[PDB]
């Protein structure tokens, strides 16, 4: 790696851009008006990329010949990038006061903030504003698994009366889907903050490398089928590879996909005769999840659940909700998205129908699937010196207001109602709106603060 | 990084699944039916994560402990790893026929295949399913940005009469936009095999490290300014940061955000009246760029055309299109995506003006904001070898045909008319239609052909 290589490239070329005598260069991180976020993030990127020695003179030279050729010229500060490496041992002199991860942010706030701690690297600031920008992904993740949640609680309560296995509705089927494996595993990290439930092995590394988890199990999986798994077997041996499946794993549960070929087939016949002494001998502890995995994904539940609730045992739960016997339950795997999910836990609803029944499993749409558009992540300047002058800067583009930025120093608070408030013009210090809840998390190439991920998780949590 | 722990996490699971006594699946993948995709990527992905010794007593160790914990159960399969380890020294018995980097291929065509080359090792090739489906990424970048090429050149050809430099209208900006550093890198990479115009300096390394570039850095960049480096000077001193950085950079050529306050100011007063005399002094090699940012790109673009048209020397080319002095072009460095393009272009076109005067920048619309979805990027078992005889798998949900997957060995040809054939079951066997095209590209853990960044570029060339 080398951060020296790692932001955009006019970048390099802003040092002489800055107004001349410029000690210090002030910004921050808001998610401009999804009302409330939750912020997840930043400490992976803090500890991987920003914090211990950053600045190597082969990282310096390197760049300098990239550079040199990249522009064509060189462009590229050596000379500033070699005080760093000389009077900070290549530790960056920057300080970021960021809200505890996990928290749940009201659009429009502060969530972090970036200053040079020496007048020297004033240009320091924004350099890396593109690395920590990168943020913006691991919260919009753990921002839409969340707002996901909710809809998940929302009807398993209506539906269940209670919210048990609400950590598990929603499986992260992502690896498949998203543009890189560092992305897999940052992506798959931000879910985890709202489910235990996830394929990506690639999450839980990233958790026991960058937040630690005391918590026995940092996510969740249980043996299941891919296409290849039942169509090797050959369009006649459908059933013989079901039963072979469900019997390699009677002691656990087991998900199997039954769309290769008619999902109505399986799930009627194979399952609903040819099979069914092989699920209604299972434990409640180890049923099988008949999974669908094409079609419209709420007409497909539907139907799956129609015909399932007329081959099995369906009490009616308290509520009034239709329920599969214990051993045998469904997890949409296919088309599940944000809007998607709503509609078939709804449409579930309305067919009297429980959503203890279902569970879902997104992948491309939860992990990838996601712009910096969505929670309008955005990193921007508010307050410079120069000359020993305080400014507060900011970008009031006519022609997009809502595309504002703020002005002056900020300071996160909470407003005397419960919800949050970010002072801007430095007016924090006007002691008023009690602490600043923004606590410093990086200082000079050190990380100054922490969250396990268990931490995260009680502070993303809902109701 | 650990192969082991890098799949999903139910195919750890697969092995007991598949039918006994198998011992080959061969598996392919296709853009299932952007009628022609760039294959791309998939290079990089053999290199940096299944070459060489991939599999050690310790990375085994480390999934069984993960996996342990993952699922509560021993399901992991250590000793299929272990042999692995063992006869092949941790490199993965498989081999890969992949079509050559950088070359278009229509919809429905397989770009590549992955078979266990022990029998022992049917397990492996779905096993990486997950991984080398990854490779949908940089596809579909590589794709997608090839396809905004065709538009740009379209227009740029019908309004200059040619193409120069049809290869710097796109610059990528998506940096800040991705959700990961690696993602950057790889997405960066793509964009770079139909544009020489990048920022997002991230592709380059990978390129130069994974597939090696003659020229000197495979794209380049010009220094530009943000919207901190113009609004530290203050709301009132936005000439001053203007004119400091146009002088700092007279020298070569320089791009500079106009809309941080109203993008029709600037334009008509600060660039057109006040610093009017440092435009058209520049050269024509070194021209300043100005660069909006504000609101709906197509209308922003006429007007600010409108306006330096208006300030400045217009000149009808000849074709019709009206064009700037050589020292002012501008760039649509906000809102454009391969849709948006088509549209300001066009908008462009019919009021107009010449495609000359403006290129591009895309950021997460270019990096981010692309799913395997788009180019139905997947990887399918299509044969599988059980109890000696082959068998040709596929799956067909009925409630979804546009699902079916190829079935048996398949093998990509070249039709009599040129375009291409991918033959199932086998029948490229027939010699019938020529050669298969797909050539192996990876043999036991080992690089068997690689294709350097300019055969790449020249197989994704268009027209
Ligand atoms: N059943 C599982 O455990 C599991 C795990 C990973 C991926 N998948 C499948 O991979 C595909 C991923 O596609 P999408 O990312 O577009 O959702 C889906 O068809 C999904 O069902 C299933
Ligand atoms: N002018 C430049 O060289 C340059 C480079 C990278 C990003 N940017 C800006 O950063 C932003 C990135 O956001 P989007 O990726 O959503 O486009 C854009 O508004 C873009 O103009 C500009």
Redesign the interface.
Same mark, same amino acid.
């Given at each position: 790696?080398n951060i020296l290589?790692?932001? *955009?490239?006019?970048?390099?070329?802003?040092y002489?851009?800055?107004?001349?005598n410029?000690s210090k260069?002030y910004?921050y991180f808001e998610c401009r008006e999804y009302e409330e976020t939750v912020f997840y993030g930043l400490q992976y990127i803090l500890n991987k990329?920003l914090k211990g020695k950053v600045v190597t003179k082969e990282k310096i030279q390197e760049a300098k010949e990239?550079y040199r050729?990249?522009?064509?010229?060189d #462009?590229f500060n050596e000379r500033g990038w070699n005080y760093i490496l000389e009077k900070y041992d290549g530790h960056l002199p920057i300080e970021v006061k960021a809200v505890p991860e996990g928290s749940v942010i009201p659009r429009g706030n502060v969530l972090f903030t970036v200053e040079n701690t020496d007048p020297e690297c004033y240009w320091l600031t924004?350099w890396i504003?593109?690395?920590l920008?990168?943020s913006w992904?691991p919260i919009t993740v753990a921002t839409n698994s969340r707002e996901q949640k909710k809809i998940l609680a929302k009807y398993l309560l209506e539906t269940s009366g209670n919210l048990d296995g609400l950590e598990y509705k929603l499986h992260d089927?992502g690896?498949?889907? #998203?543009?890189?494996?560092?992305?897999?595993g940052?992506?798959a990290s931000a879910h985890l903050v709202n489910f235990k439930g996830? *394929?990506?092995?690639?999450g839980?590394?990233l958790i026991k490398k960058y937040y630690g988890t005391k918590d026995?199990?940092? @996510?969740?999986?249980?043996?299941?089928?891919?296409?290849?798994?039942?169509?090797?077997? @050959?369009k006649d041996?459908e059933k013989?590879?079901f039963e072979?499946?469900v019997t390699?794993?009677s002691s656990?549960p087991v998900?199997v996909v039954s *769309?290769?070929?008619?999902?109505?087939?399986a799930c009627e016949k194979i399952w609903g005769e040819d099979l069914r002494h092989l699920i209604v001998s299972r434990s409640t502890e180890a049923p099988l999840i008949i999974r669908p995995?094409?079609?419209?994904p709420l007409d497909?539940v539907l139907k799956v659940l129609d015909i399932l609730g007329k081959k099995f045992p369906v009490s009616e739960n308290s509520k009034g909700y239709k329920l599969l016997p214990p051993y045998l339950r469904v997890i949409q795997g296919d088309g599940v998205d944000i809007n998607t999910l709503q509609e078939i836990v709804e449409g579930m609803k309305q067919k009297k129908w429980s959503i203890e029944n279902v569970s879902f499993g997104s992948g @491309?749409?939860l992990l990838?699937?996601?712009?910096?558009?969505l929670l309008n992540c955005s990193?921007?300047?508010s307050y #410079?010196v120069?000359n020993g002058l305080g400014?507060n800067?900011?970008?009031?583009?006519?022609?997009?207001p809502n595309?504002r930025?703020k002005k002056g120093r900020l300071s996160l608070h909470r407003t005397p109602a419960g919800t949050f408030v970010t002072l801007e013009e430095g007016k924090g210090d006007l002691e008023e709106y009690g602490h600043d809840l923004l606590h410093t998390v990086f200082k000079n190439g050190k990380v100054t603060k922490s969250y396990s991920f268990d931490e995260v998780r009680k502070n993303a949590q809902l109701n």
């Open positions: 790696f290589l790692a932001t *955009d490239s006019y970048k390099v070329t802003h002489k851009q800055y107004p001349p410029t260069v910004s990329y990239v050729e990249h522009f064509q010229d #462009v924004n504003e593109t690395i920008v990168q992904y089927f690896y498949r889907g #998203v543009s890189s494996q560092e992305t897999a940052i992506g996830t *394929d990506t092995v690639a839980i590394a026995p199990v940092p @996510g969740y999986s249980v043996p299941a089928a891919e296409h290849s798994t039942i169509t090797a077997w @050959g041996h013989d590879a072979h499946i390699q794993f656990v998900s *769309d290769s070929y008619d999902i109505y087939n995995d094409s079609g419209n497909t @491309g749409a990838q699937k996601l712009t910096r558009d990193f921007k300047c #410079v120069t400014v800067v900011f970008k009031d583009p006519v022609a997009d595309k930025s």
